[PDB]
């Protein structure tokens, strides 16, 4: 449920049309955590199990408490891992549309990875959703080097990490409805738009 390695376990002979790469928050289990499974279920509904590959960022991304305090909100190894998956997706399935997402530390991670991402693969990222984006204030609600029309940030009122703090209040753990509704809806919308549908 909370771990999905569709990409790693993915066969180039049987590529999916859409590949979703998601990064969990600090301390979350699996490679998807609490919000990932919700987003995954909706994409599967719109693209069928065979149409989309769900891949969480595991491996070197340990989703450590201390890494939130590093300059970019996460570690260099974590950024390397996610970068590595965008590259694996582009190699195995050059025609698949890419979409991404992250929550809390995973949000800062998604943002750093996309920022460091080679233009070409980045251009393939139809849309990205970020919940409780820890660098929201610092990056002005954007992902550096990634267009605003493709970025959607879910930052609750009262969520202190969205306004420059590294402290958690109730609003930070209240993204469940966003992950079950608005978030996958935005992702499905952008994918359809790029593939035409």
Curated annotation (Swiss-Prot):
Regulation: Inhibited by n-undecyl phosphonate (C11Y4). Inhibited by paraoxon.
Record note on temperature dependence: Optimum temperature is below 30 degrees Celsius. Optimum temperature is 30-40 degrees Celsius.
EC id: 3.1.1.74
GO cellular component, one term: extracellular region
Gene this protein is translated from: CUT1
Top-tier EC class: hydrolase
Key word Disulfide bond present: yes
Catalysed reactions listed for this entry: cutin + H2O = cutin monomers
UniProt-reported outcome of changing residue 65 to A: Increases activity on p-nitrophenyl butyrate
Family: Belongs to the cutinase family.
Protein name: Cutinase 1
Description of post-translational modifications: The 2 disulfide bonds play a critical role in holding the catalytic residues in juxta-position; reduction of the disulfide bridges results in the complete inactivation of the enzyme.
Organism this protein belongs to: Fusarium vanettenii
Superkingdom classification of source: Eukaryota
Active site: 104 (nucleophile), 159, 172 (proton donor/acceptor)
Effect of residue 68 to A/L/D/W: Severely decreases activity on p-nitrophenyl butyrate
GO biological process, one term: carbohydrate catabolic process
């Amino acid at each position: 449920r909370t771990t999905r390695d569709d990409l790693i376990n993915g066969n180039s002979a049987s590529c999916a049309d859409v590949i979703f790469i998601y990064a969990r928050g600090s301390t979350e289990t699996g490679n998807l955590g609490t919000l990932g499974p919700s987003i995954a279920s909706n994409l599967e509904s719109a693209f069928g199990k065979d149409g989309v590959w769900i891949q969480g960022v595991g491996g070197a991304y340990r989703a450590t408490l201390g890494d939130n305090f590093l300059p970019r909100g996460t570690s260099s190894a974590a950024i390397r891992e996610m970068l590595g998956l965008f590259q694996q997706a582009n190699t195995k399935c050059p025609d698949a549309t890419l979409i991404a997402g992250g929550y809390s530390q995973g949000a800062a991670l998604a943002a750093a990875s996309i920022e460091d991402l080679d233009s070409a693969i980045r251009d393939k990222i139809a849309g990205t959703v970020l919940f409780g984006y820890t660098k929201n204030l610092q990056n002005r609600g954007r992902i550096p080097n990634y267009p605003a029309d493709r970025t959607k940030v879910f930052c609750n009122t009262g969520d202190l990490v969205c306004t420059g703090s590294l402290i958690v209040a109730a609003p930070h753990l209240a993204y469940g409805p966003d992950a079950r509704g608005p978030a996958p809806e935005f992702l499905i919308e952008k994918v359809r738009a790029v593939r035409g549908s």
